[PDB]
Design a protein around this ligand. Structure first.
Ligand SMILES: [Ca+2]
Length: 221
């Protein structure tokens, strides 16, 4: 997260860290047995770390749970990152508490201008922001017109832009797969963008609100 502020510890209880030796992507707990992330973060197996604030030190609220299933969206394509969404089933249910809580799926699609929160342990491009601690940032959803204008022909119906065309505030590598929450619902998944926080290059996110059926259907399994 570039240009944000440190999240208060456990203020984003749905935020999870996908770990394979080291943190490599974010994710969002949507129920005790399932986590939503980006398809490009895929691995046959991954360790889900919940209840994290500082990912380098044990703080007592962590729960490390190995995956039992990793399911990429059937229409995910690596050539353009279309349908960059994925579900991770936990081998054992997460124990919900004050530090670990699921985030609701969208009950509607958030329109342009809606303010959201994006968080993660990715690149901060800062010499003062402790990258080991969960970073927070508020970003508004941009219109499709702004999105396509920024990335001509690269935006599908499964993507939306959020952030500021002026630059300075954006998510970044390492935040990938992480949450974009607006009005208490998971509207997006950190996916891609040109560089980070660059003017005219806003962040692009998987549009969770058009995947409700696939998500619900898949979680029945
Ligand atoms: Ca920790």
């Amino acid at each position: 997260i570039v240009g944000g502020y440190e999240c208060k510890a456990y203020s984003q209880p749905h935020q999870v860290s996908l770990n394979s030796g080291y943190h490599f992507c974010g994710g969002s707990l949507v129920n005790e047995n399932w986590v939503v992330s980006a398809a490009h973060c895929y691995k046959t197996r991954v360790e889900v770390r919940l209840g994290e604030h500082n990912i380098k030190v044990t703080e007592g609220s962590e729960q490390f749970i190995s995956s039992s299933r990793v399911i990429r969206h059937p229409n995910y394509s690596s050539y353009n990152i279309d349908n960059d969404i994925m579900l991770i089933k936990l081998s054992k249910p997460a124990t919900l508490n004050t530090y670990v809580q699921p985030v609701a799926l969208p009950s509607s699609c958030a329109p342009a201008g809606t303010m959201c929160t994006v968080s993660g342990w990715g690149n901060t491009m800062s010499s003062t922001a402790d990258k080991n601690k969960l970073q927070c940032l508020n970003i508004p959803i941009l219109s499709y017109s702004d999105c396509n204008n920024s990335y001509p022909g690269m935006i599908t119906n499964a993507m939306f832009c959020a952030g500021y065309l002026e630059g300075g505030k954006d998510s970044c590598q390492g935040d990938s797969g992480g949450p974009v929450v607006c009005n208490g619902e998971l509207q997006g998944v950190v996916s891609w963008g040109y560089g980070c926080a660059e003017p005219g290059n806003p962040g692009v996110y998987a549009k969770v609100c058009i995947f409700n059926n696939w998500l619900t259907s898949t979680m029945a399994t």
